[PDB]
Design an enzyme around this catalytic site. Sequence first.
Site, short mmCIF file in Angstrom:
data_model
loop_
_atom_site.label_atom_id
_atom_site.label_comp_id
_atom_site.label_asym_id
_atom_site.label_seq_id
_atom_site.Cartn_x
_atom_site.Cartn_y
_atom_site.Cartn_z
CB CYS A 1 3.99 0.73 7.13
SG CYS A 1 2.26 0.39 7.44
N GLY B 1 3.90 5.89 10.27
CA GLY B 1 5.19 5.81 9.63
C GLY B 1 5.95 4.55 9.93
CG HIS C 1 -0.32 -0.09 2.51
ND1 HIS C 1 0.60 0.84 2.92
CD2 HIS C 1 -0.42 -1.00 3.51
CE1 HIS C 1 1.06 0.50 4.11
NE2 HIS C 1 0.43 -0.59 4.50
C1 LIG Z 1 1.52 1.63 6.73
C2 LIG Z 1 2.39 2.28 7.68
C3 LIG Z 1 1.83 2.46 9.07
O1 LIG Z 1 2.70 2.26 9.91
N1 LIG Z 1 0.49 2.78 9.46
C4 LIG Z 1 0.29 2.77 10.91
C5 LIG Z 1 0.72 1.61 11.57
N2 LIG Z 1 0.65 1.36 12.88
C6 LIG Z 1 0.08 2.30 13.61
C7 LIG Z 1 -0.42 3.46 13.08
CL1 LIG Z 1 -1.15 4.54 14.22
C8 LIG Z 1 -0.34 3.73 11.71
C9 LIG Z 1 -0.74 3.06 8.67
C10 LIG Z 1 -1.14 4.39 8.50
C11 LIG Z 1 -2.30 4.73 7.80
C12 LIG Z 1 -3.10 3.74 7.24
C13 LIG Z 1 -2.74 2.40 7.40
C14 LIG Z 1 -3.60 1.33 6.80
C15 LIG Z 1 -4.99 1.44 6.64
C16 LIG Z 1 -5.72 0.39 6.07
C17 LIG Z 1 -5.09 -0.78 5.66
C18 LIG Z 1 -3.71 -0.85 5.84
CL2 LIG Z 1 -2.80 -2.24 5.37
C19 LIG Z 1 -2.98 0.17 6.38
C20 LIG Z 1 -1.56 2.07 8.12
#
Ligand SMILES: *CCC(=O)N(c1cncc(Cl)c1)c1cccc(-c2cccc(Cl)c2)c1
Lengths: 306, 306
Positions: free
Chosen positions: A145, A143, A41
């Site tokens: 991910c 951030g 994504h």
């Molecule tokens: C993708 C990176 C990320 O780290 N995101 C995130 C992860 N853990 C905690 C938080 Cl608070 C945020 C993330 C940020 C926005 C959207 C997503 C998301 C939404 C729907 C499906 C997926 Cl696979 C990801 C993740």
Amino acid sequence: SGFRKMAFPSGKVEGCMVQVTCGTTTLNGLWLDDVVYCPRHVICTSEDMLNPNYEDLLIRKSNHNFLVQAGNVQLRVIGHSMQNCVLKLKVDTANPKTPKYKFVRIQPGQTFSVLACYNGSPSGVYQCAMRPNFTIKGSFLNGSCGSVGFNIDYDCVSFCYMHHMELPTGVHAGTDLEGNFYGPFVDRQTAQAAGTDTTITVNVLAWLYAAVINGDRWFLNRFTTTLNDFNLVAMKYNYEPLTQDHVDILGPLSAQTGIAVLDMCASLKELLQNGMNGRTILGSALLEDEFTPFDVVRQCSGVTFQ
Amino acid sequence: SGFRKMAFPSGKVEGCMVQVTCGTTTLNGLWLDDVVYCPRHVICTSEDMLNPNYEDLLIRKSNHNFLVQAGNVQLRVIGHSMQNCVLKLKVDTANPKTPKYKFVRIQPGQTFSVLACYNGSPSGVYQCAMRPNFTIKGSFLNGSCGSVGFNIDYDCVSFCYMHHMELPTGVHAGTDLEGNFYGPFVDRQTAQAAGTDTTITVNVLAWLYAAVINGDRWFLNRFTTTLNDFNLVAMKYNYEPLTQDHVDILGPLSAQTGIAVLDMCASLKELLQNGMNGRTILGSALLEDEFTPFDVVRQCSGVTFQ
Ligand SMILES: *CCC(=O)N(c1cncc(Cl)c1)c1cccc(-c2cccc(Cl)c2)c1
Ligand SMILES: *CCC(=O)N(c1cncc(Cl)c1)c1cccc(-c2cccc(Cl)c2)c1
């Protein structure tokens, strides 16, 4: 002695973390040999993340749409492909810090270390368990991910987890490094939720053995129980069943402490039915279920990694 | 979100760990530039460790009596000296992995990461606090001496702890990297013991703010309290006094949550006087005191290190 929630040394994984940027989206990638792995994504915008067709989205992309930063040095992307829920970015430079590694998928109940990162820069390291419902109770902000989970066996890093998302209860979902989600979750923005969890019984027993090794004995007792009769009580308290294989795995710990496994089950039964009565075990006022029998043996005996 | 006991990434310290051997004693050393740091009781035998004269013991030693192993590679010792309770082994090779570093002594109440090692080989990483009684509740087996504690600030490693010994209650004592013990402990085998501890009040408050940031609010209340009246209750429960400086340090967390510091003190007062009544905070059934206000801000906001 002592007993801590201990992670593996993170150095070997730190040397693999990079920053991946596509459009205005920036997340973490894992750089091994000449491939960078990251959540697919990364190619989605805000409105894309609603209900995306990733094949359509990716064919619309060029190599130059992907900026990879390894420290203050730019990696040129020369190829890209999709593997389930991860992207594979072919770069022109093989990572000279690539450790010996494997891509392994773990079981609920198993633990791993997480190297949380932001902008390709490692922030912290901590130990997690795969819950029975296939979530992990992590610590992740926007951030994070692409941060990975892993175990180390002597000198070989077994990657088991890539972080993708946070669910509404504040727990986390992700994939193995082949891009296959842990549990019934998807990389779209739906109303997905964790669903009911259980306590990892064999791990609680392992931790009780850790406690006896470390001098906590107040919860021991003379009674015993059958495996069947213990499982009747486990079910009542939302604990998952104990198998003969779990009993076998607890063998070494039993033999070291001189406490039969079924005897420890009697103690767990009493702790479940009576609570802890203002006392603590290994500095905890709850029954802890995120150490495996392997984890206890490693920490109470002292194995290293090189 | 989420909240974990998070260590710093350990890579920069892993590259400094070596094995130091003298006679039949083998422990860990810290290799920075062309000096290896290690506990001075490496030169002591079993009977020496009773009541040793380290100056006499060291003059009797030659450079060649010290074997230093950096991985599978031997470092030649070209000089040695004693600095308080540590040895400084001058080697002919400067460590090419030497990070930017500092030698800092921390305060009780402050936290750090520990890279536990055996035979110069890192085994695990975990987060510790300096207790008010100058011990640490670590996890250490035989052979872990010379393992170090540290914090990282951007790219600079501030070493604060070298492990020396375990006390009879299973807690651990050691020195700063100038070889000065934390607390009233000596590197001889006496009947030394920890002595009474207290709970780190400002850290508990920091963790309550962590909980509110992460969605636990059941322990909040409308009441407030004065700083004096809170400290009257703190003393009764073996908590250490809260200062105006602690209140100031908690300012950012207060402002982010909208909960006045003295209001959180009222909540802590109620939690101390009533217990937790079968509920949990950030997955704990006890008031946790091993996260600093710095630690909470770092984890709930998301700072990295390079
Ligand atoms: C993708 C990176 C990320 O780290 N995101 C995130 C992860 N853990 C905690 C938080 Cl608070 C945020 C993330 C940020 C926005 C959207 C997503 C998301 C939404 C729907 C499906 C997926 Cl696979 C990801 C993740
Ligand atoms: C010194 C290395 C070491 O790690 N030792 C140890 C540390 N933590 C836990 C355990 Cl279980 C052992 C160690 C082993 C034997 C003797 C000592 C010792 C005794 C008296 C004074 C000092 Cl400074 C050390 C330490």
